[PDB]
């Protein structure tokens, strides 16, 4: 297995049995290569020797997500989307494929609700849609005018995903339609999250730190939560979910449907990159950052 890991952790993604997945990359140093690390224990992280499996990549790692259970999908620095299988005992990681279909960095990646297909947003303005079983791209929609900062596959409808970019556009997509995209209503959008139950309504975060709740049919119920760029909006697995918000302010604020702040963690020394609620304790929120800390926050509810 790899002997070493990188400092700048960029992604965190639980799965159903509570195992923790980290994407880690060298955002400095001689080698900007990156690594994936699977932990059966979120508390064993980030120490290399206590993991269950992990592998080095031949290029950076910007984002990742779960394809089913025995697979991982990876957004590379190299303008490519990599699908990595797990071994039988999940002690090893194996490339399902690596494909270079972007002229620039794969900024974000999301999987469609059926698990067969994936959407890869990017800085090379064209968004693309992947068939993961055939391992080939079916569609390439160059609708934006700038870097697509973030996207969000719908949690109920397989053909639907969101997209936002530095052009201030916020687009709802439907790959069944002939002109798939449609626009949703001055500061730029940074990250998006669908509400997992109100499938037609979502939230967005902007560089000014304002957080908003906006419906597909519509309007900006919002609050000035953060001071700096809201990198991620993540929804808990409750029936009544709690909206985690993590920012470049090095702080973590967790919200509810009212968008009023319930909890604030300034424990991180640098940018919080990702957040993922654990399935075995719905009060427990795990975060990672470029300060290399792996933190588990337990939230009063």
């Amino acid at each position: 297995a790899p002997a070493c890991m990188e400092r700048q952790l960029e992604a965190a993604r639980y799965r159903s049995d509570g195992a923790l997945l980290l994407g880690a990359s060298s955002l400095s140093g001689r080698c900007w290569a990156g690594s994936l690390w699977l932990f059966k224990d979120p508390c064993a992280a980030p120490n290399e020797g206590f993991c269950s499996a992990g592998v080095q990549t031949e290029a950076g790692v910007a984002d990742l997500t779960w394809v089913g259970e025995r697979g991982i999908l990876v957004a590379s620095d190299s303008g490519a989307v990599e699908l990595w299988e797990l071994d039988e005992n999940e002690t090893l990681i194996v490339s399902k494929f690596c494909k270079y279909e972007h002229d620039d960095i794969v900024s974000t990646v999301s999987v469609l609700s059926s698990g067969t297909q994936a959407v890869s947003g990017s800085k090379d303005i064209c968004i693309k849609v992947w068939d993961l079983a055939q391992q080939v791209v079916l569609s390439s929609y160059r609708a934006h005018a700038a870097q697509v900062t973030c996207v969000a596959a719908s949690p109920h409808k397989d053909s639907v995903f969101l997209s936002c970019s530095e052009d201030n556009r916020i687009l709802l997509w439907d790959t069944r339609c002939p002109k798939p995209a449609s626009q949703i209503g001055g500061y730029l959008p940074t990250s998006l999250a669908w509400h997992p139950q109100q499938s037609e309504v979502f939230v967005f975060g902007d560089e000014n730190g304002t957080v908003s709740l906006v419906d597909t049919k519509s309007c900006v119920l919002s609050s000035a939560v953060h001071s700096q760029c809201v990198t991620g909006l993540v929804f808990s697995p409750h029936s009544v979910p709690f909206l985690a918000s993590l920012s470049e302010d090095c702080s973590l604020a967790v919200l509810d449907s009212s968008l009023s702040e319930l909890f604030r963690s300034q424990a991180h020394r640098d940018f919080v990159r990702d957040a993922t609620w654990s399935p075995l304790n719905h009060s427990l929120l795990t975060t990672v950052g470029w300060d290399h800390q792996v933190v588990h926050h337990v939230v009063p509810t």
Partner: protein
């Protein structure tokens, strides 16, 4: 041969990338000095105390590799013209840091994205870095031919100036950076191209690189990438401007081993003249094609002057004013052999350094047929009256270099039946846009003179990096001999040139046309350029402050040729659409001395 490079935003290790890159034949690598996702905070606590190194250390490559094989890239997260105060000020500081590392490394050039409408702040950060003693570096502003807001797909549930504004982003950048010589354009091509009327303008810019995405390349029937013909023409022009071609993107032709895209540039650069070959390398004022046309003219005169039965008895008197080293006298003699006619010849030069050469010619080759006069053509009290006076007192601008004042001075020893060669010449003007010639004009800023007088004086040049806005119009006509008494070479003229498109005007280019004799013409006018004649280049007349023009207007320019017994000079002024100060008044910057 073509020069080329690779635009990689991912560089895991520099020796691995530069190792596989150079093997594919690229001359250089465009890469970022800091990781493009590695955002940095400077104003905001607690992030500003980030431990560790901020980038890959410069020791990994030798100083020769940095200064020659590498080009920098500004990080995409940098929006120094963002509206948000905290996103702006962190973004000003990062740019200084990525540019000063560009200096510390010794990089030859740096790539800076221009894609927004407003780039006022980005220039200030770059205006403050130029004035730091860092001259070993260049700035390649990355601006596309077609904006991202027009090349996109129209697949959105809303409806989709608009073609030229990719330039106005740029002209509003360099104007803010005072037209610095250290700022150049990397022109990002895409599959959709504008009309050729715009391209002809863009090539007036300092295009120093061309960025070619792999996504424009088609696939030929052999499976290899090619460009459709509307691109290949543009690249043929870019090659003439000697730009460096940058292969942005990734292998869409995944089987072909990405170097195939470079192979086609090394194909087009082969399969595509002597004026460009002879010319090479601005200057303030062996061409046998130019002298033959004098010879054929003399031949066409002597047969017209001398009937066929007077060939042996008609002594035809020629005066070769401005003989110099005597090539026109060899021609004046060769025409007589070619015409089989008797001529007596008075070669006139003042310059003793050349009379030494003529006098040697007289004794070695020409014999007593050739008289030489050491006194000048305006002083010499001649014994006999010329039937012909032959000359090249011409210049790049025909009435320059005192061809008229000398010939019309040497008219009092010309027969009344006589003719003059060149008998007529007419100078021609057209406006031009040239951001590179303008900077080469400012480069003449010279101590111990008025620092704006370099614009009140012309410059001879092989116009290469220039765009022409209108067909040239005749400015000044002279016909010799002057059939009239007193009337003077002091002349006034006005010209109105239409305009098609938004463009700056940086001067007016001088050409000329001359009728040596009937239907025999030397000329460097482009639409009537003489073949293989390259002795006389065009000239450039600069203006004090460039003029930014709107389509549908007219460029109205006024030139004067004025003189006294001592000095001769030009004055010029643009008065429509805007008033430019009358240039070179009273010869304060330029004269051609009588």
């Amino acid at each position: 041969r073509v020069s080329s490079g690779r635009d990689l935003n991912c560089v895991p290790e520099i020796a691995d990338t530069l190792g596989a890159v150079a093997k594919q034949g690229f001359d250089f690598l465009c890469m970022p000095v800091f990781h493009p996702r590695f955002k940095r905070e400077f104003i905001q606590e607690p992030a500003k105390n980030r431990p560790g190194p901020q980038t890959r250390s410069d020791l990994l490559l030798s100083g020769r590799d940095w200064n020659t094989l590498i080009v920098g890239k500004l990080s995409p997260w940098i929006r120094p013209d963002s509206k948000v105060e905290k996103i702006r000020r962190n973004s000003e500081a990062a740019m200084l840091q990525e540019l000063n590392f560009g200096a510390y490394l010794g990089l030859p050039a740096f790539l800076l994205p221009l894609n927004q409408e407003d780039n006022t702040n980005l220039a200030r950060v770059l205006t403050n870095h130029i004035h730091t003693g860092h001259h070993s570096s260049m700035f390649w502003m990355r601006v596309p031919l077609v904006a991202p807001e027009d090349l996109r797909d129209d697949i959105i549930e809303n409806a989709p100036s608009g073609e030229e504004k990719t330039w106005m982003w740029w002209h509003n950048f360099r104007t803010l950076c005072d037209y610095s010589k250290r700022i150049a354009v990397a022109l990002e091509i895409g599959a959709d191209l504008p009309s050729n009327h715009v391209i002809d303008r863009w090539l007036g810019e300092p295009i120093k690189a061309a960025i070619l995405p792999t996504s424009i390349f088609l696939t030929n029937k052999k499976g290899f990438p090619v460009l459709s013909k509307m691109h290949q023409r543009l690249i043929f022009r870019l090659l003439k401007l000697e730009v460096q071609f940058i292969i942005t993107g990734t292998n869409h032709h995944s089987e072909k081993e990405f170097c195939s895209y470079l192979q086609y540039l090394e194909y087009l650069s082969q399969n595509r003249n002597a004026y460009e070959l002879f010319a090479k390398g601005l200057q303030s004022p062996k061409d046998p094609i130019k002298y033959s046309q004098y010879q054929q003219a003399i031949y066409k005169c002597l047969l017209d002057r001398v009937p066929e039965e007077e060939k042996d008895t008609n002594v035809q008197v020629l005066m070769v004013l401005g003989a110099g080293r005597g090539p026109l006298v060899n021609a004046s003699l060769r025409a007589a052999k070619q015409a089989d006619r008797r001529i007596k010849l008075y070669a006139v030069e003042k310059n003793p350094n050349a009379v030494v050469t003529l006098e040697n010619w007289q004794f070695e080759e020409w014999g007593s047929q050739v008289t030489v006069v050491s006194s000048d053509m305006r002083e010499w009290v001649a014994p006999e009256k010329a039937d012909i006076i032959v000359s090249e007192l011409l210049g790049s601008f025909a009435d320059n270099e005192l061809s008229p004042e000398c010939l019309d001075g040497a008219q009092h020893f010309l027969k009344d039946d006589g003719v003059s060669i060149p008998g007529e010449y007419t100078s021609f003007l057209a406006p031009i846009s040239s951001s590179k010639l303008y900077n080469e004009v400012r480069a003449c800023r010279e101590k111990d003179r008025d620092p704006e007088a370099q614009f009140e004086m012309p410059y001879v040049v092989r116009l290469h990096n220039f765009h022409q806005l209108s067909a040239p119009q005749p400015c000044f006509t002279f016909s010799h001999p002057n059939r009239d008494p007193m009337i003077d070479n002091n002349r006034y003229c006005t010209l109105e040139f239409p305009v098609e498109v938004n463009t700056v005007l940086h001067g007016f280019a001088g050409y000329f046309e001359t009728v040596l004799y009937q239907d025999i013409t030397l000329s460097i006018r482009p639409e009537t350029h003489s073949p293989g004649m390259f002795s006389w280049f065009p000239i450039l007349f600069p203006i004090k402050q460039p003029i930014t023009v709107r389509e549908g207007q007219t460029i109205c320019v006024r030139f004067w040729r004025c003189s006294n017994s001592k000095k001769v000079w030009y004055e010029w002024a643009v008065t429509a659409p805007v008033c430019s100060a009358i240039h070179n008044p009273t010869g304060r910057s330029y004269t051609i001395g009588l």
